[PDB]
């Protein structure tokens, strides 16, 4: 019943939901705050020995196969974001409309919103690309319309195997959610009643979290494809490094004193069991450099240890 506002609260802050961090997604997306030096932060752990248990013949041992132990290396790539220089204009929208001078405050609000949005979108894109490079993707585009309410999720469970419990969330675009709503609202197989047509979970105890990130949508018209990728406990890690800087600088030489606002910050990405191939990639990757596969090595031996799986639906 809230319509009356304060001043300039109408200033649009964001349209995509970015409340997808830590406890919001059952611990699927970790947004910590810790510093780390250099463009890379790698951690090394012991690899799983392949032929630990072997058949043996006590009657004739004959020769013994040699063995050895290795050390896998994980990774955490650092990305640097920023803000284009923002002009601070004089209040010239004053025909009959009003025009304030709270440019710093307005930019602060919009910048907080878009910083949350940018880290979330980059994390989602990196996760999708990494899982696709790991082979944990199920493409459902030719079967029927393209998305089923519940029978599609069983495919992702079959991908992830005996550890299916370890998935407890489904980050998705809004269109797949509405398709689930429509198919549920038309129960060709009668397992819904009018009071239960608005289920958000996937009939397996996994809630579905909805966001319209451009990283989870691609194409247009008949090539439109939606990615609804499920996570594990802390699969995608985002570590902002506490290096926010901002300035306001005036300019001389033009007709008006040109004021500017420029900001800069950084954060780190880490996807469980996956390492960012810095040789094929770069020191500071672009958002489209993260989304490119073959830059994401599969460190963990088994797909189960790697956290996440991607479901592709039209």
């Amino acid at each position: 019943v809230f319509n009356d506002w304060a001043y300039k609260t109408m200033s649009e802050v964001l349209d995509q939901q970015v409340e997808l961090f830590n406890g919001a997604t059952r611990g699927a997306i970790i947004l910590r705050s810790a510093g780390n030096t250099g463009d890379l932060s790698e951690a090394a752990f012991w690899a799983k020995i392949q032929g630990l248990v072997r058949p043996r013949d006590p009657y004739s041992n004959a020769d013994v196969a040699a063995k050895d132990l290795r050390q896998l290396v994980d990774n955490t790539i650092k990305v640097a974001s920023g803000t284009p220089p923002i002009n601070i204009p004089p209040s010239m929208l004053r025909w009959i409309q009003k025009n304030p001078q709270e440019a710093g405050a307005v930019i602060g609000q919009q910048l907080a919103g878009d910083t949350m949005q940018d880290m979330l979108n980059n994390g989602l894109a990196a996760g999708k690309a990494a899982f696709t490079a790991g082979g944990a993707v199920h493409d459902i585009s030719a079967a029927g319309t393209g998305l089923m309410t519940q029978r599609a999720f069983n495919a992702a469970q079959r991908i992830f195997g005996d550890r299916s419990t370890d998935i407890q969330v489904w980050v998705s675009h809004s269109s797949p959610l509405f398709d689930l709503y429509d198919n549920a609202l038309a129960n060709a197989e009668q397992l819904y009643v009018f009071g239960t047509v608005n289920v958000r979970a996937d009939a397996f105890g996994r809630p579905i979290i909805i966001t319209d990130s451009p990283a989870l949508v691609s194409g247009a018209a008949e090539t439109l494809r939606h990615s609804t990728l499920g996570l594990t406990t802390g699969a995608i890690l985002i570590e902002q490094n506490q290096d926010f800087d901002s300035t306001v600088v005036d300019g001389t030489g033009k007709q008006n004193i040109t004021r500017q606002y420029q900001a800069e910050w950084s954060y780190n990405l880490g996807v469980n069991g996956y390492a960012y191939d810095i040789a094929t990639g770069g020191k500071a990757p672009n958002p489209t450099a993260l989304a490119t596969a073959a830059n994401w090595d599969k460190i963990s031996t088994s797909i189960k240890d790697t956290g996440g799986v991607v479901l592709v639906t039209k």
């Binding site: 705050s33 510093g35 030096t37 405050a105 609000q109 506490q242 008006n256 004193i257």
Partner: protein
């Protein structure tokens, strides 16, 4: 559970501009003239772009005069508020550690109270923090160092769950150089218990301490964060309006009008000869590009020539506007500046004294309450008594206390109407006694024949 540190709440973001302008006003003329572009608009922008215009702007600003009454306004208000010294109620022998050196730097609690009151009177915000070391220290957090707080309702009670503030320090190597450590302090209230996290941030690094919950002398941990935020209006986490905003705006308007007035004074202040009705023939014949204006020498002029010694006249309407600004600031601030010309009727001013001391009374109570709560938390840390009080000098417009008042207070002490300590505090506040009460007593039982 640890996220988005070094993030400033957006209300503080809206308030930083006002805080910065107020700090500039407190600094004096130099700060204002350093950023004259923000305050004084250029009279002509088309010239302003050109190099011949920027030098004109510099010369325009240098001639300008900064009144800087706001700084005096704050200094005067801190004047009557801290006349004499604040009173402390409770044991003294077990509380000397907080009184003599409140934060371990040898700085008395009175000086920190003075700083906090000045901070909360100028831009209307400040914070106190007490933490165990064994001895607790009553820290002081500036208005700009507090940068994040939360207020949720647990069991239907207004509670400050999260609070994060920044502290500056310089690491000490074997060298003589100065480095900076932006150590943050994270304060959280989970399920009615107090927890705090510190961020080491080693010089050239960023490291963080583990979670830990400070506990009282007996135990039981806590139920509220020992961080109190005092403001001009009250003691709430919400932002309060700085009391100096209108006075700073008036001072800035007066400053720009003073710039205009001083430019006019430099240009048209000097009288000008203005030889009119003159001909170049007359000039090159008699004047020769030089006029002698002394008393001993005269100058001739042709037929129908009128010399007019013309100059800018006094009581310029710009000066009238500046006088309006001075009067308006006088109307707002109690004693930012004084006036020798005016005469005040005594007794009528006593009616309006309470209204003129409105901000002084509030600030005093807000600070007194904050320091009393901090001292109570320190006592909880040390397991001392809880019925203690640190109440500032709420009485203002102080002066030497009259002989009639002296007889009155002595007679009131003879009766059972004023306690001995109350009368001692009175006679001290009136500038008539300076020894502590115990010394006066222990000399009073002495049987001096005189």
């Amino acid at each position: 559970d640890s996220n988005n540190i070094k993030y400033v709440r957006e209300d503080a973001k809206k308030m930083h501009k006002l805080w910065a302008h107020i700090r500039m006003a407190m600094e004096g003329s130099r700060a204002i003239k350093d950023n004259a572009k923000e305050f004084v608009p250029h009279p002509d922008n088309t010239k302003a772009t050109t190099p011949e215009g920027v030098a004109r702007y510099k010369a325009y600003i240098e001639r300008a005069v900064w009144y800087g009454a706001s700084a005096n306004t704050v200094d005067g208000m801190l004047g009557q508020i801290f006349a004499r010294d604040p009173v402390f109620t409770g044991p003294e022998d077990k509380f000397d550690m907080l009184i003599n050196d409140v934060d371990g730097s040898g700085l008395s609690i009175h000086q920190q109270a003075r700083d906090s009151a000045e901070d909360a009177l100028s831009l209307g915000r400040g914070g106190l923090f007490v933490d165990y070391s064994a001895r607790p220290y009553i820290k002081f957090i500036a208005a700009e160092d507090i940068l994040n707080w939360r207020e949720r309702w647990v069991n239907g009670a207004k509670r400050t769950t999260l609070l994060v503030f920044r502290e500056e320090s310089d690491a000490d190597d074997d060298g003589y150089q100065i480095y900076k450590e932006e150590v943050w302090r994270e304060l959280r209230l989970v399920d009615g218990t107090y927890w705090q996290r510190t961020w080491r941030e080693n010089d050239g690094q960023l490291y963080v301490d583990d979670w830990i919950s400070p506990t009282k002398a007996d135990g039981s941990q806590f139920d509220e964060i020992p961080f109190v935020i005092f403001g001009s209006k009250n003691n709430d986490p919400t932002i309060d309006m700085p009391p100096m905003r209108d006075l700073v705006e008036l001072n800035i308007a007066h400053f720009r009008n003073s710039a205009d007035y001083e430019e006019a004074c430099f240009i048209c202040g000097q009288p000008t000869l203005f030889l009119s009705g003159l001909t170049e023939h007359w000039v090159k014949n008699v004047l020769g590009g030089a006029v002698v204006i002394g008393s001993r020498d005269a100058v001739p002029l042709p037929v129908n020539a009128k010399p007019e010694l013309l100059q800018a006249e006094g009581n310029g309407m710009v000066k009238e506007a500046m006088d309006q600004k001075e009067r308006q600031m006088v109307a707002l601030g109690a004693k930012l500046i004084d006036s020798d010309k005016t005469q005040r009727t005594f007794g009528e001013a006593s009616m309006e004294a309470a209204a003129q001391n409105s901000v002084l009374s509030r600030v005093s109570k807000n600070v007194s309450d904050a320091y009393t709560k901090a001292l109570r938390w320190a006592a909880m840390f040390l397991g001392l008594d809880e019925k203690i009080e640190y109440e500032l000098n709420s009485d203002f417009d102080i002066n030497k206390m009259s002989p009639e008042e002296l007889a009155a207070v002595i007679s009131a002490w003879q009766s059972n109407a004023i306690s001995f300590t109350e009368m001692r505090w009175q006679i001290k506040k009136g500038g008539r006694a300076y020894l502590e009460d115990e010394d006066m007593r222990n000399e009073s039982e002495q049987d001096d024949p005189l």
